[PDB]
Design an enzyme around this catalytic site. Structure first.
Site, PDB file in Angstrom:
ATOM      1  N   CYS A 181       0.806  -1.214   0.000  1.00 44.61           N
ATOM      2  CA  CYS A 181       0.000   0.000   0.000  1.00 44.61           C
ATOM      3  C   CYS A 181       0.843   1.270   0.000  1.00 44.61           C
ATOM      4  CB  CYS A 181      -0.939   0.004   1.206  1.00 44.61           C
ATOM      5  SG  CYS A 181      -1.991  -1.460   1.396  1.00 44.61           S
ATOM      6  N   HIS A 185      -3.273   7.368   3.295  1.00 44.62           N
ATOM      7  CA  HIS A 185      -3.761   6.088   2.805  1.00 44.62           C
ATOM      8  C   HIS A 185      -5.127   5.806   3.423  1.00 44.62           C
ATOM      9  CE1 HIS A 185      -4.071   1.995   1.608  1.00 44.62           C
ATOM     10  NE2 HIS A 185      -3.695   1.469   2.758  1.00 44.62           N
ATOM     11  N   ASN A 203     -10.314   0.313   1.191  1.00 48.66           N
ATOM     12  CA  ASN A 203      -8.862   0.286   1.058  1.00 48.66           C
ATOM     13  C   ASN A 203      -8.531  -0.215  -0.343  1.00 48.66           C
ATOM     14  OD1 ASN A 203      -6.108  -0.103   1.138  1.00 48.66           O
ATOM     15  ND2 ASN A 203      -6.097  -1.284   3.045  1.00 48.66           N
TER      16      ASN A 203
END
Lengths: 311, 311
Positions: free
Chosen positions: A111, A236, A266
């Protein structure tokens, strides 16, 4: 100085609501919203892969940047879900975009991949090697989700985001960055033999809540700025509670932190550019704004960038 | 200037001879040697993965470089066969090596990956960002080989090579480089749904024979040198006939081109550092030598580097 010339994204059209999830696993709309803040997430079609989403995001970013694909020197794609291991997504979109003179490599930092990519592009541009670097963060997490596991199947969505990096008129551009990793945490978030994401959610939470804010402070410090100098924070988009910890550490108001986790979930490396596009399309980010971006990812990787927006 | 401080490798102990292959597929020792030049290749054990080979190569490179793992700023691992997609090999070896302050990402450019990695490290060092960058090329191609397919099962071996990149006393270091890609050729060399390497050998040959020599000439030209200035050539060790085309284009004698394809086969991103170690251990490469390295890979990627050896 290297800066961001334009950004684009691809958001899959299929919406997966928490009530769609309630049929599939033993979960509740209340539990998901309270613990993650997710209400919906997007899921790519069965014939839509990371390459399809990446070309779409790349085309939009090139159009916004007024950059022709034939002028790209480098294509970097941050992904852990390529159509296949080789040819890479970067090679695939180099062909589909007509980016002939461009080199192409995929990078894997989970990520945090979009941050690793933008910083890598920065190095190639500021050395005078290249002028235009395309950086794409794309994931089809739906393809590595155990849709039987309620602990992870409610967390992940699909998407792609892209940025064209190039020289900008000084004062502007990337002011500072931090890249990090901690292989010790590899046991806490990994792909198993079934290509299913296994996660120790409690451990990943503890790590993220303390590292996101610290990376943010570091890049502000390295840029020679203060917390009051930050005009926007783009974290994020994994968990609203983790995002809130970063906002507190920076003493930022609610309206100065991008929040799209509730609508897209996500999306791993795609998360930050997807949120960037959202704020730019709402006009909340303007030339001259100091923007901090920060992410954490599997393998335990992390990254943060402070950029003064504009060309 | 960024240069190479030390190199190491891991070669699996198990030897797979052409006569071992003769039991497995409808092939002959004569055919393999005549068309590829391979006589043996190494195969990693069933409990030895890319991470195990990469730590071993990395340890040897760090020891040769007199660099402590705790002093690494960055770990780059070029591979298409990681133990799992995340955590990456770079994250895994960051933990096993004790490289705490180092960031970590895997990069995917198939058999050109080690070149992409070294050039990437060069950018981070010459900008003053980092000082020590570990670059590892590792592949367990045996894990993505259809061992029933005689067309590919006789081509591939396993291994890892590693280099520590850092600042060197000027005149030395990386003089020039070229990175390239051509997504059009993606159909000719890809991983299929069974995680088996599918290849159009004739097409990949045509592309490689003309691009290897041209990349070589380009980096010599960019370094402001002549063909007579090249002291050694380290090509990707895929096929002796492809390697010979590059030697001809550079007008180099046989003893100035590294040849290890006959003993290790094609080890993809590991091939060039494995050959580098071989020549350094035979004392054929010395400080001040101009060394050209060049590779081509799946997705159609390629790269070349001209380096003046030494610190």
């Amino acid at each position: 100085k290297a800066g961001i010339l334009g950004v684009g994204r691809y958001i899959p059209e299929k919406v997966l609501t928490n009530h769609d999830l309630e049929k599939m696993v033993e979960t509740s709309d209340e539990w998901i919203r309270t613990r993650t803040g997710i209400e919906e997430r997007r899921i790519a079609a069965d014939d839509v892969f990371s390459s399809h989403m990446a070309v779409a995001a790349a085309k939009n970013a090139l159009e916004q940047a007024e950059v022709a694909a034939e002028d790209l020197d480098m294509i970097l794609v941050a992904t852990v879900t390529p159509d296949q291991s080789f040819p890479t997504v970067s090679c695939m979109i180099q062909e589909q975009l007509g980016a002939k003179k461009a080199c192409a490599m995929d990078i894997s930092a989970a990520c945090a991949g979009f941050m690793y990519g933008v910083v890598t592009g920065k190095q190639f541009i500021e050395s005078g090697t290249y002028k235009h670097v395309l950086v794409v963060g794309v994931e089809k997490l739906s393809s590595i989700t155990d849709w039987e596991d309620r602990n992870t199947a409610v967390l992940f969505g699909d998407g792609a985001g892209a940025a064209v990096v190039g020289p900008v008129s000084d004062d502007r551009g990337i002011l500072s960055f931090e890249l990090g990793a901690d292989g010790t945490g590899g046991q806490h978030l990994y792909l198993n033999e079934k290509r299913h994401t296994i996660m120790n959610g409690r451990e990943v939470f503890k790590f993220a809540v303390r590292q996101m804010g610290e990376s943010c402070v570091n890049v502000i410090e390295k840029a020679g700025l203060s917390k009051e100098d930050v005009d926007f924070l783009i974290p994020h988009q994994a968990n609203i509670r983790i995002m809130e910890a970063a906002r507190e550490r920076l003493e930022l108001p609610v309206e100065k932190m991008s929040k799209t986790v509730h609508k897209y979930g996500n999306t791993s490396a795609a998360s930050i550019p997807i949120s960037l596009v959202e704020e730019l399309e709402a006009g909340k980010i303007k030339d001259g704004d100091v923007v901090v971006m920060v992410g954490f990812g599997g393998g335990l990787t992390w990254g943060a960038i402070a950029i003064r927006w504009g060309r």
